[PDB]
Structure formats: C-alpha cells, structure tokens
Amino acid sequence: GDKGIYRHYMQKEIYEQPNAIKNTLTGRISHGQVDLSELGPNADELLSKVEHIQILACGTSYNSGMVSRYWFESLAGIPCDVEIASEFRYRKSAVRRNSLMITLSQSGETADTLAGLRLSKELGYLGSLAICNVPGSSLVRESDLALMTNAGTEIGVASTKAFTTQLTVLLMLVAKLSRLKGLDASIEHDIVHGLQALPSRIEQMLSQDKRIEALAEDFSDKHHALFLGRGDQYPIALEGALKLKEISYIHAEAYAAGELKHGPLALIDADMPVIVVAPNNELLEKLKSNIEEVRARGGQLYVFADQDAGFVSSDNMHIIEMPHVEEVIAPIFYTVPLQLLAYHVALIKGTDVDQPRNLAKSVTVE
Numbered sequence: 421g422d423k424g425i426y427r428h429y430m431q432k433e434i435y436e437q438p439n440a441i442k443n444t445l446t447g448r449i450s451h452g453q454v455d456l457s458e459l460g461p462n463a464d465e466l467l468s469k470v471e472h473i474q475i476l477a478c479g480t481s482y483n484s485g486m487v488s489r490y491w492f493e494s495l496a497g498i499p500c501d502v503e504i505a506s507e508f509r510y511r512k513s514a515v516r517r518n519s520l521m522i523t524l525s526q527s528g529e530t531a532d533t534l535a536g537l538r539l540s541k542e543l544g545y546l547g548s549l550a551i552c553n554v555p556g557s558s559l560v561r562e563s564d565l566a567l568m569t570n571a572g573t574e575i576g577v578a579s580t581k582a583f584t585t586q587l588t589v590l591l592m593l594v595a596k597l598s599r600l601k602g603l604d605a606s607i608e609h610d611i612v613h614g615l616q617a618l619p620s621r622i623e624q625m626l627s628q629d630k631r632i633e634a635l636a637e638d639f640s641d642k643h644h645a646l647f648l649g650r651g652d653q654y655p656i657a658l659e660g661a662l663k664l665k666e667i668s669y670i671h672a673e674a675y676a677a678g679e680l681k682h683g684p685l686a687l688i689d690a691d692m693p694v695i696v697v698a699p700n701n702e703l704l705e706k707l708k709s710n711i712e713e714v715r716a717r718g719g720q721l722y723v724f725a726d727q728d729a730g731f732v733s734s735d736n737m738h739i740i741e742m743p744h745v746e747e748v749i750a751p752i753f754y755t756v757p758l759q760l761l762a763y764h765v766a767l768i769k770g771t772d773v774d775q776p777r778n779l780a781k782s783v784t785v786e
C-alpha cells in the first residue's frame with residue numbers, strides 16, 4: 421500500500437532499512453547472544469555437524485551470499501562456497517562432506533534457485549536452510565529450516581532492505597555457528613555488538629544523504645563505471661555496480677580491486693569513473709597510483725572511505741567521507757551510499773525506479 425512521505429517504494433525501502441533491521445533482530449538477540457532456537461527444538465546438532473556451507477541464489481541474493489562467504493571462512497572458520505543458482509543446476513557438482521544448503525532469496529519463488537534446492541535433495545546435502553523474506557512459499561516450504569528476514573513486503577523491483585536484512589541473518593548464522601563449534605566466544609559478541617549498533621549506523625548514513633545527491637551529478641550523464649572492492653567489500657562493489665546497471669541503466673561493472681591492473685585499467689577515461697569501496701591505506705596507494713597512470717585520458721577515482729582514515733582528495737582522486745563503523749558490519753554499511761547513489765542518478769535521469777525496464781520482481785516462470 422502507501423508509500424508514505426516517499427516518491428518511490430525503492431526510496432522508502434532504502435529509508436526503512438534501519439527498522440527492517442530491527443525486525444530481523446526482534447528476539448534473535450537475547451542476553452547479548454544469538455537465539456536461533458526459533459527453528460524447531462531439533463536444529464542444533466544438525467547445525468553443529470556442519471563442516472561446509474553451499475550458498476545458492478540469483479542476483480542481489482548471490483551478492484549478499486558472496487559477502488557472507490568472507491565472514492564464515494574467517495569468523496566461524498567454516499568452509500564456504502557460493503554459486504549462481506543456474507550454474508549449479510546445470511553441472512555434475514562434487515558435494516562436500518556434510519554440506520549445508522543455504523539458499524538466499526527474497527521471493528522464495530526464483531525458478532533457478534528453487535530448482536538448485538530440488539537438485540540438492542538427491543545429492544547428499546546434510547540439510548537445507550532457506551534464508552528468505554516471503555512467508556511460506558516454495559523455497560520456504562521445501563526446505564528443512566528457514567529464517568524469514570521480515571522486512572515487510574519490498575515492492576521495488578531491485579532489492580534494498582531485502583539485501584541488508586539477508587546480511588544480518590547471514591551474520592547471526594555466522595554467530596550461532598561460531599560458538600556451536602567451540603570458538604573463542606569473543607567472536608559472537610563482536611558480531612552481536614556490531615549487530616545492535618547497525619540500525620542507527622544506517623540512520624547515520626541516511627543523513628549523509630544530501631552528500632550523495634551531490635556526487636550523483638558526477639555520474640548522471642555517464643554510461644560506464646567501474647566499481648572496485650577488496651575482500652568483503654568486493655561483493656559490495658558487485659551490488660553497487662548492479663544497482664547502477666539496474667535503475668540508472670548505466671553500464672557499471674564491478675571488479676576485484678587486485679585485478680584493476682590486469683585489464684580494465686586499459687578502459688578508464690573521462691567516461692568511466694572508478695569507484696573504490698572502503699579501501700584501507702595500502703589499497704588506496706595502489707589504486708591512487710593506478711589512476712595517475714591514466715590522468716591523461718582524464719580518469720577519476722571516487723573513494724568511499726572512513727572519515728577517520730584521514731584520506732585527502734587530490735584533483736583526480738576524490739574522497740567521499742563516511743562516518744566510522746565497526747569493521748564487522750562495514751560491508752552492510754557501505755551498501756547504503758551505493759544504493760542512494762544509484763537512486764539519485766535514477767532520479768535525475770528520470771528513469772522508472774520502481775519498475776526498471778526489462779527487469780522483473782522475480783523470475784518464477786521458465
């Protein structure tokens with residue numbers, strides 16, 4: 421129903437992120453630990469028998485997963501593999517010892533993943549956790565366990581609150597598994613703190629909103645962009661690029677920041693801004709140096725970084741300062757400026773934000 425004070429559902433969806441995240445934390449946090457016993461009185465020796473994760477979705481959902489793979493592998497120490505649903509459903513895959521099947525999805529109707537799960541039944545999958553946002557549908561029903569992200573319905577065609585909430589649940593799950601494995605419990609609380617920080621850290625970004633409306637102008641009449649990201653921020657480059665493709669129709673493409681010099685450098689000029697997401701200092705010095713290599717074709721570096729990094733803008737490296745956040749939820753945090761950025765370009769360009777062209781709420785049908 422009602423958009424409220426908003427021009428577009430997507431806008432609202434972006435501004436709802438702080439609440440939506442509260443709801444995803446309604447009684448999952450309790451006594452400063454993570455409580456996933458909302459999952460059958462069964463549940464736990466299952467989840468403690470796990471020594472490998474296979475995640476499986478499409479689109480913005482693969483992005484979120486792609487992110488959570490970093491976490492798991494380093495926080496919870498549990499091997500993690502992510503794959504595009506379609507890629508999985510059309511190969512003889514080599515199942516892992518005690519693999520858990522997480523399928524991520526907003527609609528729980530995405531044919532390609534739905535199917536990716538149905539192939540897993542017959543393959544040796546320890547069991548099946550479907551993180552997802554629409555109450556009781558194919559992906560929910562057909563899984564052993566579900567974690568309904570509860571963000572209200574999302575009407576916009578590209579996903580915003582859906583994404584962040586999936587990352588929060590990812591983060592809980594990372595937490596629950598870390599302790600149910602024996603790991604020094606300082607780890608779970610870090611995640612938790614970070615997790616209860618998060619909602620008001622999103623409202624912080626949102627106020628730094630006007631500053632993005634500014635930057636959008638720089639990109640509103642471009643038709644190329646290169647998003648760059650390292651480790652957990654890379655999949656945020658993925659999502660950021662995707663959002664730009666999606667609603668501004670710009671051809672933004674994401675990339676391992678390690679890999680710039682192995683190709684796309686050759687592409688950069690005044691019509692293809694680079695954007696790095698949340699670099700550290702040693703990364704900046706590499707990218708800064710790269711971009712000089714192309715000052716003469718007129719290329720620019722745009723950097724979203726911690727205001728605390730003390731980075732300084734040159735004539736062709738432009739720092740866009742963000743507030744400090746906790747390392748552990750950084751990935752989730754740096755997503756909002758990228759969403760808002762896509763959003764403002766779209767607004768200025770005047771494109772159909774809520775239903776972008778040729779794009780679908782979900783691909784159910786074959």
Ligand SMILES: N[C@@H]1[C@@H](O)[C@H](O)[C@@H](COP(=O)(O)O)O[C@@H]1O
Nearest residue numbers: 479480525526527530578579780
């Ligand atoms: N337009 C949507 C997206 O916004 C989303 O990232 C993707 C996966 O859909 P789901 O999360 O419902 O599995 O597919 C659709 O194309």
